[PDB]
Every structure is written in structure tokens, then in C-alpha cells.
Design a protein around this ligand. Structure first.
Ligand SMILES: CCCCCCCCCCCCCCCC(=O)O[C@H](COC(=O)CCCCCCCC[C@H](C)CCCCCCCC)COP(=O)(O)O
Ligand SMILES: CCCCCCCCCCCCCCCC(=O)O[C@H](COC(=O)CCCCCCCC[C@H](C)CCCCCCCC)COP(=O)(O)O
Ligand SMILES: C=C/C(C)=C/[C@@]1(C)SC(=O)C(C)=C1O
Ligand SMILES: C=C/C(C)=C/[C@@]1(C)SC(=O)C(C)=C1O
Ligand SMILES: [K+]
Ligand SMILES: [K+]
Lengths: 415, 415
């Protein structure tokens, strides 16, 4: 019969450290306290690029503490932005873990991102148009390539059991943690740094998503604009983030005296084959990704206390995900939609929300979904709102979905 | 007691169809015949961009049959180039396989690529710069995102068991087949379309790579420029390609009466943690990727008949790979380096070379490595050269490596 975590057919895998930088704080613990106190990272954008172009979207969450105030002169010339973000979070995470001395040959890195060092593409293009091929940096290829942030972290921390970069648009950061889990349970690694990084809010990304008519334009009240599951939602809001976690076998963690924050029990990856940029309405394949993570974990849907929803606040996205949660039999879980406060960080967001799922399990508390004011009869979920919801949560699923029809669900447990 | 293909701990997985477009032919079967007859796809580049910029590199292999001679006018605007290649190859592969009726919920797609729809990044940038944010296409995001080619193919063919895009630079096309094999042996799918696609030779990619000093500049003799393992090699040559294969459990293939071309037995993924753009000289982690594919296959290195080398023709690269082949105990095997004839197709190339490994096994023959004229004493490999070599080939490993330090090896068997 089928290997599961519960039946011992997969080894036990624990989360032993987390790190993130957000529009609320550069410190994940302070981001967590702010979320619980009802704080939002979303504000009026003050960038001159908003005025230069008169963008229809004038709201978003920049990082509280910009990555580049941490970067040396050479990093600014030799790395793309997602690489600098990767380096920053990778060193923070390692220090957080107690700087363990691990076997490099049993250590993997899996880090997702939406695009890569795309600013270096436009830089290279301009440099060559103005001055010819000899003006392109000899570092352009390694700064641009989308595996470049994962590679930087792997080099920095010494990972020799693989360095992988799954890209699946807005599920990339979750999918990275899924593949790290597979690398460990298939025997390829005992320890893995995983998660996601993403570029900052800029004019061209805004322009491109805005032309999809995907984004909230509630510019006069920025903190109220992101309303996942609310009746009056009008699209997503960008909120910058990067997040990594350290996962390892329980035996590896025990042998070095690490204190686990949670367990990572299983991962489901499916696809819709429905539309390139809208989720299937029926939620069936998305609900199957949740169900698969439960099969691998050895759990039933009634075990699931908590769902951390992808919850983008688009009208059709939230409706599809509500249907997916019912398909999976998880619609009596308490649901949190963290994009209500942190906005959408695209290739990083699944990793950020998996970190938040881990903290919910460690601490016994789910923050309030901001802006949740008018229940939507198509949604019919238990959306935590108003104040935090306390409980002894045993098991939780984190959802992420991505343009291309990608569905990723991760099942975590209390340690 | 570790599961392996040979001990029945993983299900048997077979290759049932292959498709590729190359500098030699749009048709994989003709490419193969061309290879065996000693044909090269590498010529003088006739593009106006070469003289416009006076590029240092004036050679390479364009597709014999351009992807866009097959494309509708709408697709030329609303798909990126790699998406159009994916659509073309995906349709051709399915028709080659008999257009089988599979269970969509058991059908995955995994397709790697080096970058994605990056021409749409520069086009969006220019369009906005000239006319504002509302000139950017509403399709730009879904054309640009690096998962875009895999997602096009998943939607086209109806894959609902997962659509994945691993990015690991020059090893992406092999890594995709590795993850497709994992998706099947972990029980998430019974059938998968997998491989890699890549963009065409253009001015800015030539500038960026050639500023790395990686590329041959033997412009006076183009078919003699790509010289993997030859003492007088001087770097790689671009040769365009895309390649997909259909794999499925042997049970699945048997139930629908499909004739297997070969077996995909195991896949190893490791990393160097050495340098962003040079492979580790000792070949140790790269040899471990080969060993790991053998472990999962249940083979010993003494079983290996044939290695399809990554063999870029850089001085450093080929020397590191020969060390790797020694580390893995595979240096008694017959070695082919197809970039000698087909050049380097970056994100696609490990998929293309995986298809060539399958055909070697199917037909009992290895094509000659072109331009292999002076053995290099640091290499000391049995390089197939001169004429095709016929043989009873039973087991082969296809190697692929990438910037960032990624190592992928696939173990294939004769059906
Ligand atoms: C909250 C998350 C937001 C996510 C955003 C979307 C993620 C897309 C990737 C983001 C990459 C951008 C990194 C910016 C680095 C930086 O800082 O560059 C500024 C100066 O402007 C620039 O160079 C902007 C150049 C734009 C680069 C091209 C971006 C193309 C975007 C596409 C047209 C639209 C998005 C495609 C996404 C597909 C994948 C996900 C589904 C510093 O200024 P200075 O120091 O020079 O004064
Ligand atoms: C086998 C070679 C592989 C090389 C490719 C390397 C991977 C990059 C893939 C890029 C895909 C390009 C698709 C070209 C479409 C096409 O054909 O458009 C021409 C007109 O030129 C263009 O717009 C070229 C636009 C440039 C796009 C930006 C490319 C940036 C390249 C980086 C600076 C360097 C490469 C980074 C690779 C990182 C990943 C691999 C390690 C027809 O013009 P028209 O007559 O129809 O008007
Ligand atoms: C297949 C397309 C999908 C899943 C679209 C979703 C719901 S995922 C996401 O982050 C946003 C903004 C969406 O619109
Ligand atoms: C870590 C760096 C590596 C593997 C570099 C290699 C050998 S892989 C490749 O396709 C080319 C052109 C190279 O130079
Ligand atoms: K979530
Ligand atoms: K090869």
C-alpha cells in the first residue's frame, strides 16, 4: 500500500527556520506580530514613476526595509535584484538556523521566482542599442537567467545535492517548497533551503498586469483595497516580499539539536487545462492538489483545521478557490487570506504564505483577514476576520495557484 | 531497501514518441539520418544583424524549417516564440503518438526553457516608453512568463496532473524529463509530455554569451567550429532546437498498444557549489548526478555502454565532464558529443540529446562526433568519431549541465 508520512513510508520532514522580508517589516517575527495586530503593508505609491506615467494603479506595498540598503557596491553591479534578495534572505535564514554545519552533498536549494533578472534584460538591450555588443556585461547571462537567485543561494550556502528553480507564475514559491520536500523524501537530500523571491513594484509590471484588468484601483483608500473573499473585491494589490524556510529530516534536526517550528507532511501539484489566465470555475483540479497533499501526508479532510488561501481578491479567483476548498472537503477549516494585508508578491507569495502557515501552527493563532466586511454567498467559507482566531491547530493546507493553470497545495502539521 | 526501477520499487517507464526540430531538419527521423551521414547544421550566419553589429561570432545553426512558417497571424502576436515552438512540437508529438485518448487527470507536462518569452519584455518596454502604460499588450504577462511554453502545451493537450517548468539554464531540457519521470514514479501521473524549447539565434543573445568568451569564433570554417573533446576546441556554437518526448508507464503503453522506443530508468540531479559560470574541475558532483541516476535505475557503472556527453567544446567544460565520467566509473563507455553537429540550444539541448540517446538505443548505433581530429590527453575517453558506430547498446546516460552549477543525468535503457 501507498507510502504516506503518517505510515512511515516517507521520512518525517520538519521546518526548522523561516525568514522573510515584507511590506510590514524586514523581520518575519515582527511581520507576524503586525499581522495579528491588524496592520496592513499597503499604502499610496509615492514613486515618481506613478506620476510620470499617470498609472491607473497608485497603491501597493513596497518592502519596509529595501533589499539594497543591505548590498555592497559589487553586489549592485554583479547581481540582479532577485539575486540580491536571494543572497540577503539566504544569509539571514542560515544565521537564524544557528549556522549549522551540514553535509553539502546532502543539502539542496529550491527557490522559485516569477521571471528572473528581467531588469538586466532591458539594461543589456539599451546598452547594446546605444553602444554595440561590447557594451553588454559579461555578467548579463548569469544575472538574467531565472535559476539565478537559487544558484546564488546554493553557492552562498554550499548546497551540492541540487539547486532547482520551478517556475509556475504565482504558485512558484509554494511549488519550490513542494519540490524540496520531494528531493528529501525520495532520498536525494536531508536538508533544503526553499521558498521564493520576486522583484519590486515598478511601472512596467504595473502596466502589464493592469492591462489584464486584474488589479484593484481603490486608490483613495489603499489599506482597504485588497479584499479577498469580500463581496466588494475589485482585484489584487501588489505587496513586495521574499521568503525562505529551512526544512530537514526530523532525524537530521534532532541530531543537531534544532527545534522544529512545524512539520511539512505532503505536497500536491496538479493543473487545470482550462485557461491560461483564469482558474477553472469548478475548482476540481485545484481541490485535487489539496487532496493529493492529504494522501501523501496520510490525512483526511476533517483533520484540516486551517486553510491559508491563495485568496488574491479577484472576483473570479476567490470564487474558484472557494469551490476548490469544497471539492477537497476542507470548507469547515478556518480560512485566512494574507494578501488582504501583505498584497501579492507573485513568484514569492506561496513561500511567504507557507511561512505564515508554519507560524499559525507554531503559535496557535490565525490573523484576521483585513477588509472582510460583506460575506459573498458564492464563497461560503469560514473567513477569519475582525480579530485573530486562536486554537490548537493540528494540520493546515497552504494553497497557491498560478497563471498557466498551476495548482499547488502544501500540508503542514503542528510539531 | 531502496526502491529502484530494476527491483520494481519504481514502475517501469517507457518512451513512446519523440519529436524535434533542428538546424539539420524539421523532422527528428531525418535529423537522425543526417547525423549518421555526418551532416552538420552549423553555417555562416546570413542575418543582417551580424553585419549591423559586426558580431565576433558569425556562425551557428538556424532551424532548417523556421517555427513561424507554420504559425497563424494571431499566434505571431499573442504567443511568444517559445510558446509557438511548444505548440508546434506538442501537436506534432501527439499526432506521432497516435493522438491517444489519455485520462487528463493522469497526464502531466514538464517542459524546460532557458528564459521564456523575453522578446515580449523588450517589446513591452519599448511600447510603453514610446506611448505609455496603456500600450502594453493585455497578453504580455502570459507570453512573457517562463512557464508559458509548458502551459501552452498543457492546455493544448489537456494535461491535468501538473504542468511544470524547471529552469537550470543549459540543463533545463534534461531536468524537465527528470521531473516528468519523478511525477510518474511518485504516482502523480501515468503519462507525461516532456522536454525543452528555446528561442532562436539573435544579436543580443550572441552579444551576451560572446562577452563571456565562451563561444567559438572559427568563423572561416563553420562546420569545423564545434569541436567537443578535440584538442583544438575554442568554445561552443549556437544551434537552434526544440524537442519533446512522450513517456508513460509500461502498463499504460501496453494497454493502448504503443510500441516503446526505449526505457527511462532513473534521473540524478546534483549541484556543484563551485562557480556560477564554470563547472567544478574535479567533476565530482557531476559524476554523482550520473551515479544517482544509476542507483535509481538499479544499474552499476559497469552496465553502461554509452554516454551522450553534454560536450559543449569549451576547454574547461569538456575537461570537467571527462573527470565526471571517470568519477562515475563510466569512462569505458562509448561517448558521443552531438553539439559537434547540432550546436548548443541552451534550454532545449538536454531534451534534444535525450531524444538522441533514445534513438541510439532504439537503432543500435551512435553517430560520429564531428571534428574530433586530435585526441586531448586530459580527456582520455572513447569518443565515437569518423563513422557511425553500430553496437548492441543496452544502457546509456545522457549528461546535461548548466550555469549555476546544475548537473542532470538521465539513465535510459533499450526496450
Ligand atoms: C510586489 C511584487 C511586484 C512584482 C512585480 C512583477 C514581477 C516581474 C519581475 C520584476 C523585475 C523587475 C526588477 C526591477 C529592478 C529595479 O529595481 O529596477 C528599478 C528601475 O526600473 C527598472 O529597471 C524596471 C525595468 C523593468 C524590467 C522588466 C520587467 C518586465 C515585466 C513584464 C513586462 C510584466 C511582468 C511579467 C511577469 C511574468 C511572470 C509572473 C506571472 C530600480 O531603479 P533605479 O535604481 O535604476 O533608479
Ligand atoms: C540556439 C540559440 C539560443 C539562444 C537564445 C538564448 C535564450 C534567450 C531566448 C530569447 C528569445 C528571443 C526570441 C526572439 C524573437 C525573434 O525572433 O525576434 C527577432 C527580433 O529580435 C528580437 O526581438 C530579439 C529580442 C531580444 C530578447 C531579449 C533576449 C535577452 C538575452 C539576454 C541578454 C542574454 C541571454 C540570457 C539567457 C539566460 C538563460 C540561459 C542561460 C525577429 O524579428 P522580426 O523580424 O520578427 O521583427
Ligand atoms: C489560471 C489562472 C489563475 C490560477 C489565476 C489566478 C487566480 S492565480 C493569481 O495569482 C491571480 C492574480 C489569478 O488571477
Ligand atoms: C557551472 C557552469 C557550467 C556547467 C558551464 C558549462 C560547462 S554548461 C554549458 O552549457 C556551457 C556553455 C558551459 O560553460
Ligand atoms: K496561501
Ligand atoms: K548530452
Amino acid at each position: 500500500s501507498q507510502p504516506s508520512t503518517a505510515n512511515g513510508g516517507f521520512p518525517s520532514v520538519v521546518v526548522t527556520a523561516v525568514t522573510a522580508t515584507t511590506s510590514i517589516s524586514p523581520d518575519i517575527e515582527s511581520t507576524w506580530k503586525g499581522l495579528l495586530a491588524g496592520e496592513s503593508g499597503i499604502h499610496a505609491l509615492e514613486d515618481e514613476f506613478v506620476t510620470k506615467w499617470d498609472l491607473a494603479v497608485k497603491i501597493g506595498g513596497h518592502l519596509k526595509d529595501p533589499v539594497d540598503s543591505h548590498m555592497g557596491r559589487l553586489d549592485m553591479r554583479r547581481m540582479s535584484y532577485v539575486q540580491r534578495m536571494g543572497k540577503l534572505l539566504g544569509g539571514q535564514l542560515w544565521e537564524s538556523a544557528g549556522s549549522p554545519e551540514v553535509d553539502p552533498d546532502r543539502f539542496a536549494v529550491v527557490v522559485g521566482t516569477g521571471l528572473g533578472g528581467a531588469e538586466r534584460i532591458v539594461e543589456s538591450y539599451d546598452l547594446m542599442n546605444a553602444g554595440g555588443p561590447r557594451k553588454v556585461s559579461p555578467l548579463a547571462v548569469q544575472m538574467i537567467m531565472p535559476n539565478g537567485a537559487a544558484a546564488v543561494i546554493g553557492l552562498q550556502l554550499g548546497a551540492r545535492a541540487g539547486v532547482m528553480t520551478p517556475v509556475s507564475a504565482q504558485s512558484s514559491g509554494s511549488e519550490a517548497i513542494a519540490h524540496a520536500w520531494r528531493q528529501i523524501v525520495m532520498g536525494d537530500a536531508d536538508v533544503a533551503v526553499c521558498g521564493g523571491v520576486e522583484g519590486p513594484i515598478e511601472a512596467l509590471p504595473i502596466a502589464a498586469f493592469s492591462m489584464m484588468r486584474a488589479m484593484s484601483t481603490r486608490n483613495d483608500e489603499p489599506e482597504r483595497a485588497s479584499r479577498p473573499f469580500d463581496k466588494d473585491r475589485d482585484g489584487f494589490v501588489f505587496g513586495e516580499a521574499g521568503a525562505l524556510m529551512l526544512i530537514e529530516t526530523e532525524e537530521h534536526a534532532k541530531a543537531r539539536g534544532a527545534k522544529p517550528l512545524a512539520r511539512l507532511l505532503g505536497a500536491g501539484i496538479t493543473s487545470d487545462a482550462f485557461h491560461m489566465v483564469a482558474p477553472a470555475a469548478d475548482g476540481v483540479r485545484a481541490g485535487r492538489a489539496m487532496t493529493r497533499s492529504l494522501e501523501l501526508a496520510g490525512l483526511s479532510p476533517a483533520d484540516i483545521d486551517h486553510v491559508n488561501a491563495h485568496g488574491t481578491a479577484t472576483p473570479i479567483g476567490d470564487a474558484a478557490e472557494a469551490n476548490a476548498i469544497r471539492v477537497a472537503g476542507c470548507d469547515q477549516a478556518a480560512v485566512y487570506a494574507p494578501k488582504s494585508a501583505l498584497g501579492h508578491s507573485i513568484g514569492a507569495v506561496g513561500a511567504l504564505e507557507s511561512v505564515l502557515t508554519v507560524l499559525t501552527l507554531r503559535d496557535g493563532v490565525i490573523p484576521p483577514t483585513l477588509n472582510y466586511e460583506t460575506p459573498d454567498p458564492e464563497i461560503d467559507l469560514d473567513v477569519v476576520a475582525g480579530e485573530p482566531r486562536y486554537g490548537d491547530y493540528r494540520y493546515a493546507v497552504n494553497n497557491s495557484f498560478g497563471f498557466g493553470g498551476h495548482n499547488v497545495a502544501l500540508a503542514f502539521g503542528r510539531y
